[PDB]
Amino acid sequence: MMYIQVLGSAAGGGFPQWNCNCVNCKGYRDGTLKATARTQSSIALSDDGVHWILCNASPDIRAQLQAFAPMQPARALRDTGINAIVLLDSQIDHTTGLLSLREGCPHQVWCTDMVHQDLTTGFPLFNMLSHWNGGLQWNRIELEGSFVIDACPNLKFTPFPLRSAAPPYSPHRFDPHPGDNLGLMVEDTRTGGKLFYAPGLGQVDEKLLAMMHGADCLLVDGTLWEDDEMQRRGVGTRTGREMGHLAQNGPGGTLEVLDGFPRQRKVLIHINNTNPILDENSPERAEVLRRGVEVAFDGMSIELLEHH
């Protein structure tokens, strides 16, 4: 059994976003909209429900941990369910949470060389946290092969490279390198059950579709419904392509991509506050569910039992 817990299901900024008054955010606050608040994207993985691997440490980590009981096993006066942390990129909304874990150092942190570079220079979390009882102990994620974290020895992680898009603070933001971003394939080696986790997906190719067809659950980028969604809401100018996010709708959208995966479980995650699928009464929500695709929410539990 592979346990997948959705701690946070929103894109950066959360839902509602602190400074946003778009139709969703303002409608939520006014109570005129049927939607559920969401923290910034993070999931927890486990092969026993007791030892947990964190994927991305969101700025909302304190509320996310508190909301999920297994994160506090209470086996001693100081204790936690986090046995390791995996970073998919060096972005601020995926790493800031580590600062809130300073009281429980050391932590094993798995990330690529490029991400380790960013996090020892432009956002030197490793340098900062090292003053707290050994800080973060780096474990290198290689750009080939797989890795196993001893706390969950039945989980086999196979990372795959995504289009390099280093954070704006990154010394090499204008110089993208392989290792800047990745998606995860996670396999329960006892059953064969595979999770495909790609919260940040800007493009698909043949190699990608091939490994998706080998997976049992598809947990993918659901940031924007339309590529110019920020313009439509009137709260920004950046497109989904500029942000490295494939929209759900239109030709080449994820919904069209997901049509070739009828047998896989399909869940949209990392959803922006502007996305209509957050409105549970939207025709966009209805279309998603009509296509057999789920919309992730904070507290969602995905059980991965076996392999197709």
Next chain:
Amino acid sequence: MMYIQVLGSAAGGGFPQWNCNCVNCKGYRDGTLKATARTQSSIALSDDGVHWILCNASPDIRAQLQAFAPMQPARALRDTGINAIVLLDSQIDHTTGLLSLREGCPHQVWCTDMVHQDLTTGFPLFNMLSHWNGGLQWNRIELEGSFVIDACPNLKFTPFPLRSAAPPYSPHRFDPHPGDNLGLMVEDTRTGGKLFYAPGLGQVDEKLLAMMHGADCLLVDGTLWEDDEMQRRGVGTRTGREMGHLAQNGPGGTLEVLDGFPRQRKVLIHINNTNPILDENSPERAEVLRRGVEVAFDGMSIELLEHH
């Protein structure tokens, strides 16, 4: 009228603390203890209830803003009640919140030279955030005199130096300098009403007591009940003196110090998860209230009407 909003009232780690199972934290989670959850220390100030000055940006800032309606005036599709931010030190639990405000840059940030140094080197928030639409615009807090933030032109801030204790990440942590920590005197220049804000107070002297007697509301360090409180709970070794916090109890404690201030309003803030005054049925809580001292809580509103 001076409005003071308590966004967060706990010391670092919050209450409950993510990794802590002391009598308070575990008792809260079990529901066997009568206590209220608290986010990490931060207050908001205003002279009109519309424009707000943030003091310290806690890691819990997203939940703190969402919980206080004036933080979202909803005057445009993107908007906020934060018009300026004041930092009292460069500690992680007082500055991390700034990262969560990247979507609404630029922000005016007021802090001392020493704090600006830390935040451009060991924790280079200013360097990181500058890639977000102008980032943080530094306004120097001088170690003498006062300053006025134009958004709240009736609020006069007079900072006062506290014992220098630079954060562990700080290049000059072993070399403390004046400007590392300060407390605030805030005056409504229309009424004369003064707030004394010293969330981090490790020692008192004659100069300190003299300016406290000139204030109307005393909002001070309430981290530990006892100096060896971390040892008593069994969750650490550090003392309140090692942490730069004066305990409430015993000779020289804050309660004894506050006895010489019968006319002032007295509120304890920045309270550690281990502190018995969090237990609303504790004899420690009872003693505090018996001495005319209040225990701050998340969402507390303090109205400063006039001067004694």
